Design a protein around this ligand. Structure first.
Ligand SMILES: *Cc1cc2c(cc1C)nc1c(=O)[nH]c(=O)nc-1n2C[C@H](O)[C@H](O)[C@H](O)COP(=O)(O)OP(=O)(O)OC[C@H]1O[C@@H](n2cnc3c(N)ncnc32)[C@H](O)[C@@H]1O
Ligand SMILES: C/C=C/CC/C=C/CC/C=C/CCCCCCC(=O)OC[C@H](COP(=O)(O)OCCN)OC(=O)CCCCCCC/C=C/C/C=C/CCC
Ligand code: HEM
Ligand SMILES: CN(C)Cc1cccc(NC(=O)c2ccccc2C(F)(F)F)c1
Ligand code: SF4
Ligand code: F3S
Ligand code: FES
Lengths: 138, 239, 613, 102
């Protein structure tokens, strides 16, 4: 028998039988490294959705950009109410940027021990809250 | 007398219409060993001789008793029982695996993947083998440390979320580290084509450095580090 | 029996076992061109051999200049002259060739300044035939040498088309009119039964350490092949000779290597004195396993305890260099921390002499052929081979030399392959077995599957293990051995009253451990009866009443004015043990040790001498 | 004897460091020339980003065929949408600047 035949006979046996898949998402213990990879997907997808909505509306929706700004100005420009929108845009962007650097540091080969992971994970998490408050204040 | 509670995953294939369920066993810790396997065998010997599980060395150097205890894939003979009596130890089979019976997963695909990487010394001229000992400098031997020690418990691979979703086409942490183990071996001549065997999007590039592999390894090894080191070789190697 | 589907398999050769010997024999046949099947109850990597820590002996001469003939002398001297010198010759000569073979397969041996395979000192090994002092010939992969051996032997076996029957519990040998036809096996996965028939059968199932309460061996070391031989009415050899490894952790019963003593480990008693120099002056704490454990076990009887309840002794690593305990012995550095809770660089290791090696087993040629005993003479069983710990070519004889088993594995695994490659060709006539053959093994299986007695499998196992531990320890007297014999015989009748709960086909660990119990018992009976009958202190088997080493001559005084003792009056002979399966009766025969070598001119016979270091 | 999977991985990390460099470069030097390069890097990295998500979760021969097409259609429209905005409207840099002091 060969390696490819063993894999081919593996699936043929299990799928045609009443064997259950052992629990995975339900049972596995969470950690900071774990959770921080979910967010990088989330932020990546949310940011791509944001960019796409900005591009697609330009071709579909009529008027110039200044026309759309005056449309937002119709509601009350609350000093802390508009801060919510301004923070809610940058927060995922900056997290993904900081965590993206951490990913690039990893692909370079450095910082792949369990202590260093949880260390650099916090650094990314802290830089986010600081840069997101710092940019919303601009 | 200290009483510890164990909640264990149970499934019988020979019982008609038996659905997976949890079964609780209580154990006195005074006349029992310190490790989880010591407890597992104690309920096997006395309380219920239906609890089917894999055991061998009880030494942490074979990889039979690999299972998910308290949300972590480790060896039961190495993991000591939490002396906290109020907490109930939840024992599960290796995550996202076909259950043969109780805590016994079908590792056939896993082993098969290890066969596909060719984990054996390959020289371009094997006519002179069996008579001369191959020379390897003491520094080239240091390169294999942290890699050869792998016991193939499947703990790391079965902890990888990407290996859950793509177990069929992605090799996983354990298997990939062994591919690397035979890459940097100074005696191996096939370093180039060992990398070319990974030139599809699934074999190697299904890793996203989630790092669950190195975190859960019972032997303390670092497969993820090696996997990232493979990726580096893939972008640099020529011809 | 109309409940069990039988699926017959047809091969050229069947190797039962996936250890070192098991694997080497397996792919060696495939490499030779044979259609080979490999039957194993574990996954090949889980095989004990993985737990091996010390090293593998070869006279490569990488530290100093060495000769394999000096290694020959050390092994036979260690075997207390019960070792068959034809087999020891073959192994010691093949020692350098077989190691080079493994390193070329891809085994990551530790390296030297030169770049060659790192060798190190070990117990009972000496240069220049015992005269030249300490010898360094133990090749090792750091402290995980058996692990790496098994992995690279397994790794290499994927290169060949060997049919692996993974997790298949071999029940009995398929036998017909003396000649062996193969094996009948239970498939653990679906509960089915398979009659795998071949021309030649290789039994490599390892030791039966689980016969005792405290052993270094794995839970799956249950001497299964040994039982298959005795259920066929064939004899077992030297089963009373059980090795007690001097250094094994008191707690769970785990093992720290003899390589601890090889690098520079010291043994400490009650006062703190190096008590091993008090017993053996020349070899000190790096003496043979039967001598070192003899000291430790008797030290507790003096009252000189070391533990909380005063039962275990010590192995100290308080003084050893920190950087040495990272490249030479990193495997014990972690395993002592887990079970004992001990830092190896600052705190001493608590140890007790515990069951380690079974030098006894299935009687074997130097060619690896199984031997039956007919009319006081030797006779080869057609198509039946054995290698490794389960075998007994008596390379180890009365006492195994340190780090020789992993050699014994690779060498005699290879030997079984070569003997088949010469005697017949691949694709030869595979003899047919009766349609109703092996049915009694199936019926035995069915009886234990639906077993409903008064004593549970686990409780009877415990009753066997504790019985052997107190009656057949390091020291034993005829008085205590007699009580142990009738106690074990009583427990064989208790097998009728076995209780089994799991009634399933798929993965019945309750059934297979009960099958293992049958095997363990059959090993125990031959061990204890052979021990009580042997009235001498040879090798590991030491008698307080018969403290003398009884040979065919009194080898203390010059060999001249001495009348030779008859064969049936001394004790320098192999214990052949039979057991009637239905009544549990143990009957014993005896066959002489082989003294002649394969070539006198190349390797001279070493005559019996005084056994002391 | 091609290595397309390795080059694609390398390409991803190159555009990642390019996009990382462009963000502060846009803040420092905001122009039409920075708008298009930001429109190029922003769509590319994202297109290869979701491309990984698709290859991870989407199981099937018929589904991945449609998903990779539908993603390409979106990515093409996204790049065209940004380029139109850079040419006929204020451009990315100016749009963020106007939106911020609001
Ligand atoms: C106990 C021990 C011994 C030991 C050692 C460490 C420990 C904990 N370290 C050693 C060392 O460093 N150097 C050395 O020279 N010796 C050392 N020893 C002894 C040595 O390691 C062992 O004796 C040796 O490994 C035995 O090898 P062998 O191949 O003969 O046996 P195995 O490793 O146990 O493998 C047996 C295989 O056979 C299959 N099997 C067993 N029973 C069945 C049945 N029922 N049916 C089908 N297959 C069966 C198993 O699957 C196993 O793979
Ligand atoms: C999701 C989509 C992601 C798209 C990422 C695009 C990022 C490019 C933004 C760079 C802006 C360059 C324009 C120059 C500029 O900012 O004006 C100078 C002014 C100096 O004044 P000053 O120095 O503050 O002067 C104060 C004097 N004390 O600076 C400002 O006006 C403040 C702008 C801060 C930019 C925040 C970046 C967040 C990106 C949001 C993207 C939203 C798109 C929809
Ligand atoms: C300049 C800041 C950014 C950096 C440094 C960066 C870096 C990275 C890297 C290296 C990855 C690959 C992670 C991996 O799978 O190994 C990634 C994931 C991803 N990014 Fe970015 N990126 C940035 C901004 C953005 C933006 C603006 C978008 C929106 C278009 C985006 C969308 C995505 C998507 C969709 C993924 C895939 C999700 C995943 O597989 O985890 N990124 N980022
Ligand atoms: C580890 N838990 C239990 C959380 C959990 C549950 C389900 C999916 C995930 N995580 C992913 O799905 C994931 C996240 C980032 C990159 C790649 C992936 C993946 F490769 F596709 F697997 C995590
Ligand atoms: S790398 Fe670690 S977790 Fe993975 S199989 Fe090896 S020992 Fe187990
Ligand atoms: S657990 Fe899987 S994600 Fe890649 S580094 Fe991780 S192998
Ligand atoms: S049984 Fe050997 S690792 Fe747990």
């Amino acid at each position: 028998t060969t390696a490819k035949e063993e894999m081919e006979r593996f699936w043929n046996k299990n799928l045609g039988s009443n064997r259950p898949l052992s629990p995975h998402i339900t049972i596995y213990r969470w950690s900071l490294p774990m959770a921080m990879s979910i967010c990088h997907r989330g932020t990546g997808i949310a940011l791509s959705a944001g960019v796409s909505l900005f591009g697609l509306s330009a071709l579909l929706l009529p008027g110039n950009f200044e026309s759309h700004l005056e449309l937002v100005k119709s509601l009350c420009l609350g000093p802390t109410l508009i801060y919510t929108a301004k923070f809610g845009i940058v927060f995922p962007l900056m997290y993904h940027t900081w965590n993206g650097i951490r990913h690039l540091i990893w692909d370079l080969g450095k910082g792949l021990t369990i202590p260093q992971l949880t260390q650099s994970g916090v650094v990314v998490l802290i830089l986010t809250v600081l840069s997101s408050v710092g940019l919303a204040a601009m | 007398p200290r009483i510890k509670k164990f909640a264990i995953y149970r499934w019988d294939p020979d019982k008609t219409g038996d659905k997976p369920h949890m079964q609780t066993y209580e154990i006195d810790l005074n006349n029992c060993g310190p490790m989880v396997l010591d407890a597992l065998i104690k309920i096997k010997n006395e309380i219920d001789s239906t609890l089917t599980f894999r055991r061998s060395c009880r030494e942490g150097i074979c990889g039979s008793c690999a299972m998910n205890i308290n949300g972590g894939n480790t060896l039961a003979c190495t993991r000591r029982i939490d002396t906290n009596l109020d907490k109930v130890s939840k024992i599960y089979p290796l995550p996202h695996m076909y259950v043969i019976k109780d805590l016994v997963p079908d590792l056939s695909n896993f082993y098969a993947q290890y066969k596909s990487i060719e984990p054996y010394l390959k020289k371009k001229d094997e006519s002179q083998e069996g008579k001369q000992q191959y020379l390897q400098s003491i520094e080239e031997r240091e390169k294999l440390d942290g890699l050869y020690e792998c016991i193939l418990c499947a703990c790391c691979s079965t902890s990888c979320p990407s290996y859950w979703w793509n177990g069929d086409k992605y090799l996983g942490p354990a298997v990939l580290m062994q591919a690397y183990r035979w890459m940097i071996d100074s005696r191996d001549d096939f370093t180039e084509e060992r990398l070319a065997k990974l030139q599809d999007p699934f074999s190697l590039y299904r890793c996203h450095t989630i790092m669950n592999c190195t975190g859960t390894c019972p032997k303390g090894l670092n497969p993820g580090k090696a996997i990232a080191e493979i990726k580096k070789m893939m972008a640099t190697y020529k011809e | 029996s109309t409940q069990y589907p039988v699926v017959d398999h047809e091969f050229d050769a069947v190797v039962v076992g996936a250890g070192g010997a098991g694997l080497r024999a397996a792919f060696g046949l495939s490499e030779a061109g044979f259609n080979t099947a490999c039957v194993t109850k574990l996954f090949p990597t889980r095989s004990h051999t993985v737990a091996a820590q010390g090293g593998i002996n070869a006279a490569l001469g990488n530290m100093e200049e060495d000769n394999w003939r000096w290694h020959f002398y050390d092994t036979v001297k260690g075997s207390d002259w019960l070792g068959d010198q034809d087999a020891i010759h073959y192994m010691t000569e093949q020692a350098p060739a077989s190691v080079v073979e493994l390193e070329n397969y891809g085994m990551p041996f530790s390296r030297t300044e030169d770049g060659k395979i790192y060798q190190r000192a070990f117990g009972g090994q000496s240069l220049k035939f015992g005269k030249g002092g300490q010898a360094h010939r133990c090749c090792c992969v750091a402290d995980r040498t058996g692990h790496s051996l098994l992995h690279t032997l397994y790794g290499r076996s994927l290169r060949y088309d060997t049919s692996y029957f993974v997790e298949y519990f071999a029940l009995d040998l398929l036998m017909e009119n003396g000649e062996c036809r193969g094996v009948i096996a239970l498939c653990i996965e679906d509960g089915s039964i398979h009659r795998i028939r071949a021309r030649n059968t290789v039994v490599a199932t390892g030791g039966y350490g689980r016969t005792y309460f405290s052993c270094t061996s794995a839970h799956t070391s249950t001497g299964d092949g040994t039982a298959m031989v005795t259920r066929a009415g064939l004899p077992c050899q030297d089963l009373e000779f059980v090795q007690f490894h001097p250094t094994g952790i008191y707690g769970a019963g785990c093992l720290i290597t003899e390589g601890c003593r090889g690098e520079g480990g010291i043994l400490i008693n009650s006062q703190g004195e190096r008590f091993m120099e008090r017993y053996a002056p020349v070899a000190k704490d790096l003496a043979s396993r039967d001598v070192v454990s003899r000291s430790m076990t008797l030290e507790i009887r003096e009252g000189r305890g070391c533990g909380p309840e005063k039962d275990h002794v010590y192995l100290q690593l308080h003084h050893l260099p920190p950087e040495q305990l990272a490249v030479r012995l990193p495997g014990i550095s972690e395993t002592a921390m887990i079970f004992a809770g001990v830092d190896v660089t600052k705190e001493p290791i608590p140890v007790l002499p515990t069951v380690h090696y079974n030098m006894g087993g299935i009687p074997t040629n130097y060619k690896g052929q199984v031997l039956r005993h007919v009319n006081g003479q030797d006779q080869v069983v057609p198509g039946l081979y054995a290698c490794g710990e389960a075998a007994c070519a008596s390379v180890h004889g009365a006492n195994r030399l340190g780090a020789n088993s992993l050699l014994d594995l690779v060498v005699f695994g290879r030997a079984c392959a070569l003997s088949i490659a010469e005697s017949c060709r691949p694709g030869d006539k595979v003899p047919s077995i009766k349609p109703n053959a092996g049915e009694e093994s199936v019926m035995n299986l069915d009886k234990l599957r639906f077993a409903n007695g008064t004593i549970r499998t686990s409780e009877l196992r415990l009753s066997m293990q504790k019985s052997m531990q107190s009656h057949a320890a390091v020291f034993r007297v005829g008085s205590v051995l007699q009580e142990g014999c009738e106690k074990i015989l009583r427990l064989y009748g208790d097998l009728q009253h076995l209780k089994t709960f799991d009634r399933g086909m798929v993965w019945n660990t309750d059934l297979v451990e009960t099958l293992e119990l049958q095997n363990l018992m059959l090993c125990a009976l031959q061990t204890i009866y052979g021990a009580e009958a042997r009235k001498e202190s040879r090798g590991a088997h030491a008698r307080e009443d018969f403290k003398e080493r009884v040979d065919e001559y009194d080898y203390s005084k010059p060999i001249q004015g001495q009348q030779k003792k008859p064969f049936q009056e001394h004790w320098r002979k192999h214990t052949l043990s039979y057991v009637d399966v239905k009544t549990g009766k143990v009957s014993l025969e005896y066959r002489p040790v082989i003294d002649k070598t394969l070539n006198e001119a190349d390797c001279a016979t070493v005559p019996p001498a005084i056994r002391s270091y | 004897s091609s290595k397309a999977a390795s080059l694609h991985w390398t390409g991803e990390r190159v555009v990642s460091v390019l996009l990382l460099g462009l963000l502060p470069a846009a803040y420092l030097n905001p122009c039409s020339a920075m708008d298009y390069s930001l429109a190029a890097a922003l769509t590319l990295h994202g297109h290869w980003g979701i491309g990984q998500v698709v290859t991870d979760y989407v199981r099937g021969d018929a589904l991945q065929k449609a998903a990779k097409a539908g993603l390409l259609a979106l990515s093409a429209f996204t790049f065209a949408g940004l380029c139109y905005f850079n040419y006929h409207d204020v451009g990315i840099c100016k749009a963020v600047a106007m939106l911020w002091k609001l």
